[PDB]
Design a protein around this ligand. Sequence first.
Ligand code: CYC
Lengths: 162, 162, 162, 162, 162, 162, 172, 172, 172, 172, 172, 172
Amino acid sequence: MKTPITEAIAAADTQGRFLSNTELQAVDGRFKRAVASMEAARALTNNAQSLIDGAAQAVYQKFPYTTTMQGSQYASTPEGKAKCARDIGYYLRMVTYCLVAGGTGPMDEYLIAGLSEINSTFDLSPSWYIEALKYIKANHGLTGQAAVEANAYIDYAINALS
Amino acid sequence: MKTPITEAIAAADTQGRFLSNTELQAVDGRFKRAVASMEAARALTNNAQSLIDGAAQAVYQKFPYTTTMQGSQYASTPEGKAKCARDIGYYLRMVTYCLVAGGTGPMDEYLIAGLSEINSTFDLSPSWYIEALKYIKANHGLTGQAAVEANAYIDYAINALS
Amino acid sequence: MKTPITEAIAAADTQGRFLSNTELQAVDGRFKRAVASMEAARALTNNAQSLIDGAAQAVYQKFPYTTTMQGSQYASTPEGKAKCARDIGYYLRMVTYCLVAGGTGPMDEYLIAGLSEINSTFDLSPSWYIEALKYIKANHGLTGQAAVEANAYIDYAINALS
Amino acid sequence: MKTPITEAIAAADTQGRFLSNTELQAVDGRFKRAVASMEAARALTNNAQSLIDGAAQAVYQKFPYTTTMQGSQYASTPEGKAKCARDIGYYLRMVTYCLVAGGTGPMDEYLIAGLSEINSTFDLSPSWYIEALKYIKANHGLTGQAAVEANAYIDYAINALS
Amino acid sequence: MKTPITEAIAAADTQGRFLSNTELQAVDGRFKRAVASMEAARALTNNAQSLIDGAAQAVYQKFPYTTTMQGSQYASTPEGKAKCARDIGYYLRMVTYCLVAGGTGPMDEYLIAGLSEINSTFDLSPSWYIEALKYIKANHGLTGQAAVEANAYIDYAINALS
Amino acid sequence: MKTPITEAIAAADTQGRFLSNTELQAVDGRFKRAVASMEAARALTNNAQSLIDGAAQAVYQKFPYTTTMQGSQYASTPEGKAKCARDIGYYLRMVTYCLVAGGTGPMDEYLIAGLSEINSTFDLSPSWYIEALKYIKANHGLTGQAAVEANAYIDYAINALS
Amino acid sequence: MLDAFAKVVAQADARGEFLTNAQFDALSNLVKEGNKRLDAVNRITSNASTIVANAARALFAEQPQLIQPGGNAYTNRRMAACLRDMEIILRYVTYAILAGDSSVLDDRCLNGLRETYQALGTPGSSVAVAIQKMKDAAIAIANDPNGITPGDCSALMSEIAGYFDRAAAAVA
Amino acid sequence: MLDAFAKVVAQADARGEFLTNAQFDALSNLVKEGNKRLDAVNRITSNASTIVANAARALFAEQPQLIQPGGNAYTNRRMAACLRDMEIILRYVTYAILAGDSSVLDDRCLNGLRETYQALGTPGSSVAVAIQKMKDAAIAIANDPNGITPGDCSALMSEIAGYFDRAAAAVA
Amino acid sequence: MLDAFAKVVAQADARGEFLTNAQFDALSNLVKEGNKRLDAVNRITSNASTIVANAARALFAEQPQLIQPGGNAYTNRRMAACLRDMEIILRYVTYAILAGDSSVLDDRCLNGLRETYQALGTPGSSVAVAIQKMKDAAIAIANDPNGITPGDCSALMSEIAGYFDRAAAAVA
Amino acid sequence: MLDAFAKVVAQADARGEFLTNAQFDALSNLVKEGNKRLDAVNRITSNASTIVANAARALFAEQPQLIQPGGNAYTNRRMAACLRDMEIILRYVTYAILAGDSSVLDDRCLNGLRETYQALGTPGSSVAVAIQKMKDAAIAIANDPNGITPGDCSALMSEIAGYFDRAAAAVA
Amino acid sequence: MLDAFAKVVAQADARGEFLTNAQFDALSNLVKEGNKRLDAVNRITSNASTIVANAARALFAEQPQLIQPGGNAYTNRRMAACLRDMEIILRYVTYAILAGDSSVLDDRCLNGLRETYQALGTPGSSVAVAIQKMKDAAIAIANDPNGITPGDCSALMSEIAGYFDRAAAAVA
Amino acid sequence: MLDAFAKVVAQADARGEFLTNAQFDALSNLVKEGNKRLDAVNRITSNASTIVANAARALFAEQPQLIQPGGNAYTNRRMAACLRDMEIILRYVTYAILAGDSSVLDDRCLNGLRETYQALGTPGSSVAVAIQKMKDAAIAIANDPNGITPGDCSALMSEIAGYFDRAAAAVA
Ligand SMILES: CCC1=C(C)/C(=C/C2=NC(=C\c3[nH]c(/C=C4\NC(=O)[C@H](C)[C@H]4CC)c(C)c3CCC(=O)O)/C(CCC(=O)O)=C2C)NC1=O
């Protein structure tokens, strides 16, 4: 899983080399940034329900047809509404895991790999998810470097959907 | 040349990826460690002559035969003495370049690559150079994290000769 | 470009072999099927405007939001309406080219290659295009083997979007 | 085994693709040509003995030395005569199998692969076999497309021996 | 061209190594065997015409049909007779070149490479050439190690035709 | 193991070929040189103790520090003296094995492979061993081709250490 | 790979025999029914994306454990692999239908599949369910009497079902 | 590679156009004359070994310098290469006949051939002679009126000759 | 590849020199301004998909010839390639910003690019336009005064613009 | 490969859970003790050549059978391999220390090692001895109280010893 | 691979020993008999094509089941493979004769051969027969008293027979 | 590659000729002088490390610009490459001496070398100096009258010098 520590190791290993000071500096950078990352993680986690519930409404407000149109890929039945809220919660949980790990590895492995295939096969629009992510970014309540950390991983997801 | 910044770039590039937060943390780690690294660099530079001259004597004291034995690979003529002082100055200059770059790249490229071949072909003993490096380590006058930085690159060289 | 004739040649060529009877049978099959394929091509061509104009309306009726929602990727301005009609005409023209060539090569080369990237980057929904293709299939006015030929290439496109 | 159907499949498979209309046309071509191919197969089969016996005599008439010269590779003993008639029957049986399969696969697999090695090692002249094949071609009694089918596979064998 | 000297070099070169005593022994073996090889070469050369003329007759006596049968691949016209005598002279000249070089390189390069293709394409029987070579072997007039040398290269050719 | 016989075989094998006269000449060269090689082997063996004991003293005379300097890599204790005499005996035994095999294979496999790594890791100077080999070369008591054989393998070792 | 014609040839070659009149007649009969076989392949293939998607959706509705966190088709990588495998199996079933012989399906798809799923921890019984649902959808589409010259494709449908069953049996 | 149909499509695609009635009619006409084209390919291919061997034998009879010691087709390796090149050129000419377009011949065979022969020291004018002799033999065989339903294959023969000439011009 | 620090080392190594006090001071100053450089890279990268998409859309609005049938960005394969090249160039510009040196951009991206586009028939002047539009968008985003500790990033913006200009000059 | 943080994430992902306050607190605590972990890796690595050489020399003093003619570390090729393996094992132990997790050591180094040594005839019990001697030297160097800010690194030393023991157990 | 000399060296190296006078004498004796060994290799090799062809022809005369339709040496591909294997085995037997040691034959030819033939369904007992017939022909040719300086090559013939027997035992 | 014997054969083959008595006599004479040639190769090779080291040391004493910082043989990588090239050139000169023909040296070493050094910025005139110094040392060692049966090796020394000169001319 891609983290600043497993990247440093993998680099030394590919060259058959002991760790050097180049790599230990990268880990120190990770350990110092963890203060902001962990602030962001804990906040997002604590406020997860409200963020998830708000984000789903933002989707439905931007794209009203998703609440009316007939078909299992839409949120026009109770089952669809539940699938949608479930998905949005996956995306937020993956953001929290990135902040905890210090990199994109968890989102890359558990969500991005296969994402294009999934959306095409089940007729899920990328723009639905982008809208939910934009809501989380606007409404997470963070500032300073904690906000920079959360937004970096939210915007990574947005780019992956674009 | 291997530095924490060119490592971060090379990693993203091998995967065809934009830089992510994993990489920008590694660079921040480098920028914060540079305070200690640059202290060490400047000190070693300022005191280079005395360190070089002292280190060469330490070699000759550990290995007296190098001052008497006939042959161009030894320091028993003025020309040999000058070659030896020149070499020791190369090693110290390379240590200063590592501290400036934040990694082993300069020493790897300009001195380590080919080092085994050179020593064998010209009948230069690795242990001569290890002795000079041990003197520099004992006598550089640094403490705290500046000392940790200088010693990491001196000990890297020692390991490369072992 | 993939046609039954260039497939037959490519096969013999990969094995460094003259054409054999296996390959000449495949070409004869193509020449006999061309009667139905060319009926279909000419019909679709003759009725292209009405099919294109009808298909675009079918899209707008299935997905009314595409006629109202603000954004350049939608058909809510004259420019968007023209882009959409242009695209639908590309899809039908590519169907006619497949029927003329006797295979999928023209659609594969000029439209399918890169299709996923294009739709994602410009935020075009695959389902818009599937709806237009379903309209063409229901309304082309063909029967018998001409209909089987047209539908095979329309359904190929649908599968490529799914 | 190379037939128009296994070629069509192999082609789709190499590209990881479902069968398309390009391939189903090739199979239809095979199914329609089978009428002539099966006429030819049945005729050759029904008249196999007389064709085989006639062809062997044609060899002996063109190359009289093969009936007199001492050595196990010649037809100057009863055992040699039987080997020769056996071989000619193999060649005709392989022609019938090509017509049944709709391609060269059976002759390629069971007779052509290794053919140069066999003839060289056992001192069998290719021209003996070409003469037998020319007799079969002149005397099979077919006309129209059945004759075109039989001759295509006979001439394939001749080319393989040349 | 394969000789004991170019083999020794090629071996050292493939391993990026200077010549060693293993290789210089192989060359000495070649230099000492050259006494017998050069005896054989000179004899064959001096008696080339009579050997060539005798060998061609031996072919015609073993295979009388080659003097009567109609076709340009046979020796039933003056032009064919001349082609055959020319070929036999090529084979003997190549034997002399092997003895001069100390290995099979000249015969391998100028005659064996492509030999199977040539004989098949022009309908030349290998056994014609084997018969000529057997005559040369029986009638060269050499004994002792000169005979062992000549026969080794004649029998090499025979094996290449078998 | 590299000998003139296993080289000849390996060469034929890489080309999928029977042995030819090129290879059998190389073996004959080996069999004739064995007379000198075996003279050299037996002499060196018979006089091994005195050569080994003399060679070690020559080392100590050239490099007196090796008898005084503190450290397990030197010959300043009884254990070091024994390691050094043991090593010199390995080198001479490997020379005798080369002469017996007719090539460098035994020295290559049992001593040269890994030699640079060993000397660097245990801080053994190549020049110590070169000095011992020069003594053996000056004092083996051989002349003529036996001397050429012994010296070729001694000088091979010297080059491997240089 | 063999087709139906190649298989009869191979059997005759190992006996050293020319074909019999019964053998010839049996191959002729396959040829005469070939338009039905081409229709079946064209219809199934033309509907491949929905056959896969619909069977997948049903599977996961009946077996929610497969998509819950920790389940074998949880995460988009695992889901994409699961969907891929459905399309692969359907692809090789349709090759078998065109050839009139299971050899391509057996050799290129089913051989070693059971062992692959065991090593992964993929539930083969659930793969079998997926297959069965594709079989049912495929046959329904293939044998739809609308929009085609009327006739009896019952023997062909039995042959198609047997390939799907063969696949389902090889993975569970 | 393009066939005759692909080439018309490509031209229409770069203009953004559906086919015209004249274009459709021209492709239909090719289809209607296709049995002639299949006969020509079958006949040439079926006689490939003699077309090559006979032209080679004639070449070397007219140009003995090519086979004398030191000549470009002296030694069995060089002769085998020369014979290979004749069969290659004939092979790619027959692909062009099946396709009704020279693109496969131009792209896979003729491009860079002139320069290859210059670097080798192979005489391209002599290659051209070989080609011309194969063209003459091929057309004679293709257009033999015995053993075939009678009709006029003259336009097709002109098209075949043009491919051979195109090859001969590219090497000299 | 070199970063800003490596480049000063390389220059000193070819002279055989330890660094001067001025050299040390110049590197120290880069370090002290490094948070600005990390913000610029994070902001540009975080907006990469819109920077590319918006510039592309504008290009094709101003230059409709590029997307008309026969144009270099007509067909989805060509459009996808054109979009790829925009993302590539932006990717290597952002590496140059992190490194403070153009070497990675010059060596891995720009070298030979002009010649590649000439051989393809791609219009480099139009590529340059695309670049310029990305530069303008990137700088605007990088240097947005909202949501960041206030300060002066003007020298850094000039450095960023120079990399984009260097790219635009290398392709036209 | 996993680090300590990745392992907690993986465990939460298979349950479908956000982290708990206890989990967060445990990761925070690792971060707060990270300077100790960086010192330990820097100190061990910086002394790697002597840790290996000294343990090797001791091994062979205690086990002279290993270097006698016929022994597994007799000949310079075998000795160089034996020394390589010591440096490899130490290298992967230090990666595990940086990561705070054994996965890299288990997956890239220890898996299959026992079986490799059995097939070779290398004595794994003697490898284990070598490991144990490196562990003792490494810990002594890591936990040297001279030249470092004073504090308690006892938990970390227990963790380091466990990685070395894990290695020694996997080879014997 | 080892030759006779290498094998004595290897044995002495594992004991840490210089050669004894008996060992030296035994190698000297091999050298002194080397012209016989070179004659044997030259004679066998020079007759390789007939040794193989004659043994093959006899095998199939005695075992007609092998060439009947369905038999393991029926079809030209299988026959060519069977003939190849005879020439391979003879080739590696002659290497063993030149070396005076079976190691090349054991390591490059015989190891795993039994298992290869079992997996194929090739009858190893019939391979053994083929070998035995080549052995008999080879020895007859090697030990022909005509056209060679007279002497006693009986020990050498026993050594040659043992290599052939070793081969025959390894495949049955 | 050719040796002296191969070159005479090649020349005769292109004329279609058997060797003349003069040609035979010239090859015989080479054989008769072969012990001298084997001594020369053995002596040069046996001293290769000092021939290279001594010439290198002299070069750099005469041309200090080559080792000063910024010079082409400054840095251990560049020095190791420079030393490698000396050993390569000497290696291929000794192959030429064994063969009695320059073809191996020309084809495998000297062809394209001038252009390689131009592209690098390596001074070929300085390479030539290195070569000349190796030539002088090599000839002195080869032609040392001590410890060898006395005779005249003057023609051979001229031949050896010509190979070294050929090398020196090809790089400057
Ligand atoms: C190019 C490779 C090469 C070969 C092949 C070669 C063979 C060779 N065989 C020899 C002798 C011989 N070869 C044999 C062999 C036999 N005598 C018997 O009657 C047996 C049936 C038979 C069994 C193998 C005999 C008896 C000698 C004479 C004794 C000796 O030199 O060992 C001789 C000595 C000269 C002579 O008497 O003709 C040589 C050089 N040397 C070569 O350089």
